[PDB]
């Protein structure tokens, strides 16, 4: 119970219901490395589905019931046994309470039942942490899992631009996007967008952006232009526009991807080919991503799981690959790879996949 809650001092930066957003912090005195982790957990995109989320997923929409501490797990653990990579870093967990894939910039008001302030929550956390030691940082790693991994892709360059404009050009901003690299592919079975369950991600994100006043990275926005900013929520389209170094972690057969593809798991030929094609398409999108870790498993999320050290690609674990990435950011390194993408074509053809 080692990260302590701080509600934002700027109480106009809020969770969906107007309660203050916040962050959990465990400082490491004398470390100059800061890890800011974005939680995930889907999204909502209209009044009716946000109301239902408010009933049964309220911690993702409000801080009113948040506990005063959380235990750091995985990459947020302070024990080297659990976190070989960054156990001595300053650790920040930012709860996801904006339901907008960390993209929103709209307040609750007479016109809006809910606030969607994900993009502003990240900016405000950064600004308040500067006074608590982040001003001395050498590396700020913005990490995130699930929708928080997409949030890294949408926000890492804005954090860099914010620190530059605040006069901290020496802080190196980097991103670690876990399980947020999705494909706008054909669904295995097809449903027109007539309610929440039938609405595919491209259409739900298109509606979400309008409902949230969602914002995307400027270079990506300039490519796709107005009405088409939903494209920037898809990693393979937004990543080439980014300037900050980003390490991408993605299971090849991601469970949330399969869910949005209407796949629910004795597999017959059509579904077999669908699954194999998904893994091939994911692998293809990572071909030119130099820092990546993509095991052939059916799962979702990795970096805050306590057993995150167990999975390996080509005999290299994720904490090792991240360490090699750090070294690369000081020509490739002998025996210390950073591009690790499985080539085998079926879930759990990698023996180290989670059980
Ligand atoms: O991982 C999560 O928390 C749930 C799934 C999620 O968030 N999805 C899946 C499809 C998609 C496209 C763009 C942005 C986000 C998402
Ligand atoms: C509070 O946050 C809002 C929204 O991001 C911002 O416009 C405003 O400048 C902030 N105020 C202070 C005092 O930080």
Residue numbers in the entry: 87 to 351, 355 to 419, 427 to 451
Paper excerpt:
Notum inhibitors can restore Wnt signaling which may be of therapeutic benefit for pathologies such as osteoporosis and Alzheimer’s disease. Notum, like many other carboxylesterases, catalyzes reactions by forming a covalent acyl-enzyme intermediate.
The electron density for the acid head and indole ring electron densities were obvious, but there was little or no density for the butyric carbons, indicative of a degree of disorder.
